[PDB]
Amino acid sequence: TRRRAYLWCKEFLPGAWRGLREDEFHISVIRGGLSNMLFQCSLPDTTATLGDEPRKVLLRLYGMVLESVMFAILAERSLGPKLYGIFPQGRLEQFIPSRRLDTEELSLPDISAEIAEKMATFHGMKMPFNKEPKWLFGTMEKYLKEVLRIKFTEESRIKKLHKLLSYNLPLELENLRSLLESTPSPVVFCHNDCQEGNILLLEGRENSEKQKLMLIDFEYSSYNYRGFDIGNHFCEWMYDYSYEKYPFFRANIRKYPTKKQQLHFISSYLPAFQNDFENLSTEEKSIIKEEMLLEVNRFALASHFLWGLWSIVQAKISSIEFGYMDYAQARFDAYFHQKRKLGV
Amino acid sequence: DEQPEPRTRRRAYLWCKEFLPGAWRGLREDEFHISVIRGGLSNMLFQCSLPDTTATLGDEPRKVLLRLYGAIMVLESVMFAILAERSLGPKLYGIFPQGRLEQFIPSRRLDTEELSLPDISAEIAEKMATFHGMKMPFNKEPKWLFGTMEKYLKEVLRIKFTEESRIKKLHKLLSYNLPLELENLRSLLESTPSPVVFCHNDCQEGNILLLEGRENSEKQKLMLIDFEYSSYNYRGFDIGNHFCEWMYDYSYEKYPFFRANIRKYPTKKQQLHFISSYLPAFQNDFENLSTEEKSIIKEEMLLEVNRFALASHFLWGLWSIVQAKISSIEFGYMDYAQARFDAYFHQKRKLGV
Ligand SMILES: CN1CCCN(Cc2ccc(CN)cc2)CC1
Ligand SMILES: CN1CCCN(Cc2ccc(CN)cc2)CC1
């Protein structure tokens, strides 16, 4: 691996990387794990670059074709990290000096204003993928059917899974389908996982007011209802994954964005998504806003439902230390709370 | 043949309707237009279009090219997407397991005898030099050339024909002792400096588009397409291979379905004219180096591309023998293998190597 990374870096990267010896190779882990291990490879500080090649790069081990075409495209358009090399068991990507946002930072008005802008821009991109909005319910159905086949060993998971099934998930899915079918929402290229863990604060521009963030990790990206990408992100205000004691997240329902905070986000989103929106009548803009509010708060329900089902699947299979079943139970609690709140 | 089959076209209609924007997304089957551009079993080509009475709503193309992979993949897909993003290849509208949907570019392909026309050649040299300066996310080790020839050689040595004429042709070719000859070629090219760049690797006339509405422009009427063989490789191979293609006409309508003419290989003058467009297009300062150091570069570069042209004959000669066992396409692959090795040894004699 330290050699594998050495070979991949020597062979895929230009400049000093070409003549690099193996005892000159600097690598360290950025994230271990079982799948998608991140690494930081870099030149001797005492090595001068020959061209415009990078000094430090991010390696990503997968641990099919669409994810690669996608990442290449975003790289080409300067929407994503640059792609320096791609191979069967991973790829070399640009290393972006940054940190991830924290949960509570999402509510900072400049941060959520720029996230809205960035998601709007992400949303207007054309991609060579299927533009039929199959993804949302196709994945929920795929997960549900996995869930009604999962058998757990340990009494606790059995107990928890038994509570979740008692909601009558198949019937509840139909009630959700019914509601969203009656809720218009333009299909656009969605990130589908726009949580704080996937938003870079680019270092050196913490002082920029509108250009300090980048969106990354598009493994779930597809054409999907705009409402889901926004409602999902709103849900993510509630969940903090940096908690260091099992179950390794906190949910806080009170942290869901207020009407005022929602209007602030979409008041950024809309002008960045349709460049003619800014010239509409004050009244019309509020017609569109009030209507969008209903839209994304309904699709928020699908965020809860989808990730709840996903969280149950991950329990049975994942190695990652995370209280998946407790998270599923949190997502469904927020699902039913949001139903009562909306009166739907 | 013009009419697609019922199966494909029903599937074509679905792909177009779901992958393309605008008027495409609400088209009915009954108003979908599709025409064959190439049959076969491997890369079927179709033209797909809106009715002419139907109005585009926005960006969407009125016509696209459907490409089915047929009987056979991430590197090729990524490469095609990148070149589209950079406006070097056809735009990519749709990608899926069975194939892709690409921009339709009104054009015909160049004829073999057009490769030598001065303005054509100059631009082909600019386009290729441009093609070479690109950064691509692939392995930058120049192992494709001999890796590929080695793969073909090993397959070639263990294929047994039945059919007699195929069998006799294979025997004359093995007479030459290809493995030793391959090694001989390695030593010769091992001593021949050539910059490793991103090569098309199959820059023949049928992979160059003459763009419609531009037959007047002098330096902007061509586009290079079909990059299935592309990879980081010795610059000499890419140009050498192109010079070799001057000699082969695949439009010949009877068996073996090509004409070889060694007399059509570019003259020293024509080669210089080509690399005279290539070099200022490939590197910055070149245009204004001492007329005396421009010549050393040119002369050396000729030696290089003419030596690497030997790998062109050897690679496709081997490829061709492999194709004679596995391909069902009507083409005299064995005869073409011999034709390539004739030129190889004839080229060897020319170079005194
Ligand atoms: C799939 N995503 C959307 C739903 C929330 N996920 C839950 C999660 C958080 C942290 C960890 C720790 N590896 C695992 C799962 C993370 C991202
Ligand atoms: C792979 N390329 C480089 C070598 C020349 N080839 C020979 C060939 C031409 C036409 C046909 C079509 N019958 C088949 C093979 C095809 C292009």
Residue A1 has a CB neighbour count (10 Å cut-off) of 10
Residue where a domain terminates, one of A73, A95, A117? A95
Query: For residue B329, which ligand has an atom nearest its CA?
Result: 2
Same domain, yes or no: B35 and B80: no
CB-based contact A12 B82, cutoff 8 Å: no
Residue B103 has φ and ψ, to the nearest 5°, of: -55, 140
Residue A48 has φ and ψ, to the nearest 5°, of: -80, 140
Residue where a domain terminates, one of B80, B104, B128? B104
A129 lines ligand 1 (CB under 6 A): no
Atom 12, ligand 1: residue with shortest CA distance: A322
Same domain, yes or no: B43 and B127: no
**Residue A329 contacts residue A247 (beta carbons within 8 Å):** no
Q: Please give the Cα distance from A119 to A111 (Å, whole number).
A: 12
Alpha-carbon torsion angle B288, B292, B294, B296, nearest 10: -160
**Residue B301 contacts residue B345 (beta carbons within 8 Å):** no
B216 three-class SS: coil
Q: Please give the Cα distance from B263 to B246 (Å, whole number).
A: 9
Same domain, yes or no: A75 and A86: no
Interface check for B21 against chain A (CB to CB < 8 A): the answer is yes
Same domain, yes or no: B55 and B158: no
Asked if residue B315 belongs to a known ligand binding site, the reply is no
Interface check for B25 against chain A (CB to CB < 8 A): the answer is yes
CB-based contact A86 B18, cutoff 8 Å: no
Ligand 2 atom showing the smallest separation from residue B248 Cα: 5
Residue numbers in B near A76 (CB within 8 A): 81-82, 85-86
* Sign of the torsion formed by the C-alpha atoms of B125, B128, B132 and B134: positive
Q: Which of A68, A189, A224 to mutate to test the interface with B (most CBs of B within 10 A)?
A: A68
Query: For residue B324, which ligand has an atom nearest its CA?
Result: 2
Same domain, yes or no: B297 and B209: yes
B251 three-class SS: coil
Residue of A nearest to B91 (CA): A128
Q: Please give the Cα distance from B264 to A281 (Å, whole number).
A: 71
Interface check for B78 against chain A (CB to CB < 8 A): the answer is yes
Q: Please give the Cα distance from B303 to B309 (Å, whole number).
A: 10
Nearest by CB: A128 against B86, B95, B137: B95
- Domain around A288: 64-81+96-344
Q: Please give the Cα distance from B77 to A86 (Å, whole number).
A: 12
Q: Which residues contact A58 (CB under 8 A, 6 or more apart)?
A: A30, A38, A39, A40, A41, A81, A92, A93, A94, A95, A96
Residue where a domain terminates, one of B47, B79, B104? B104
In this structure, what CATH number is given to the domain that contains residue A7? 3.30.200.20
Nearest by CB: A130 against B18, B92, B100: B18
A229 lines ligand 1 (CB under 6 A): no
* Ligand 1 center from residue A167 Cα (angstroms): 23
β-pairing verdict for A199-202 and A90-94? unpaired
Same domain, yes or no: A201 and A270: yes
Q: Please give the Cα distance from B274 to B78 (Å, whole number).
A: 30
B54 torsion bin: left (phi>0), alpha (psi -120 to 50), beta (else): beta
Residue of A nearest to B84 (CA): A73
A193 lines ligand 1 (CB under 6 A): yes
Tell me, in Å, the resolution of the deposited structure.
2.4
Query: For residue B204, which ligand has an atom nearest its CA?
Result: 2
Q: Which residues contact A161 (CB under 8 A, 6 or more apart)?
A: A147, A150, A152, A312, A325
Residue B338 has φ and ψ, to the nearest 5°, of: -60, -45
Fill in the amino acid letter for A221: S
Beta-strand runs (E) in B221-321: 222-224, 231-234, 248-249, 259-260
Nearest by CB: A83 against B95, B101, B137: B137
Give the largest CA-CA distance in chain A. 67
For residue B289 the two structure tokens come to: 């180096």
Match 């079909």 to its residue by tokens: B226
Q: Which residues contact A321 (CB under 8 A, 6 or more apart)?
A: A246, A248
Q: Please give the Cα distance from B90 to B74 (Å, whole number).
A: 17
**Residue A325 contacts residue A248 (beta carbons within 8 Å):** no
Same domain, yes or no: A158 and A24: no
The minimum CA-CA distance between A88 and chain B, rounded to whole Å, is 9
Residue of A nearest to B59 (CA): A126
Same domain, yes or no: B142 and B237: yes
Asked if residue B216 belongs to a known ligand binding site, the reply is no
| Distance set, CA A318 to CA A239, A251, A324 (Å) | 20, 21, 9
Cα A228-A232-A234 angle, rounded to 5 deg: 120
Q: Which residues contact B253 (CB under 8 A, 6 or more apart)?
A: none
The minimum CA-CA distance between A217 and chain B, rounded to whole Å, is 18
Domain count, chain B: 2
Residue of A nearest to B77 (CA): A69
| Distance set, CA A1 to CA A89, A255, B38 (Å) | 12, 43, 46
Same domain, yes or no: A125 and A239: yes
Q: Please give the Cα distance from B46 to B31 (Å, whole number).
A: 16
B38 three-class SS: strand
Asked if residue A15 belongs to a known ligand binding site, the reply is no
The minimum CA-CA distance between B231 and chain A, rounded to whole Å, is 12
Same domain, yes or no: B175 and B256: yes
CB-based contact A68 B86, cutoff 8 Å: no
Partners of residue B34 on adjacent β-strands = B48
CB-based contact B100 A128, cutoff 8 Å: yes
In this structure, what CATH number is given to the domain that contains residue A327? 3.90.1200.10
Query: For residue B256, which ligand has an atom nearest its CA?
Result: 2
CB-based contact B93 A128, cutoff 8 Å: yes
* Sign of the torsion formed by the C-alpha atoms of B148, B66, A219 and B78: positive
Beta-strand runs (E) in B117-230: 196-199, 208-211, 222-224
Omega of the bond leading into A247 within 30 degrees of 0 (cis): yes
Instruction: Specify the experimental method.
Output: X-ray
Same domain, yes or no: A51 and A140: no
CB-based contact B82 A72, cutoff 8 Å: yes
Nearest by CB: A130 against B19, B73, B141: B19
Same domain, yes or no: A161 and A289: yes
Interface check for B86 against chain A (CB to CB < 8 A): the answer is yes
* Ligand 2 center from residue B148 Cα (angstroms): 16
Ligand 1 atom showing the smallest separation from residue A198 Cα: 17
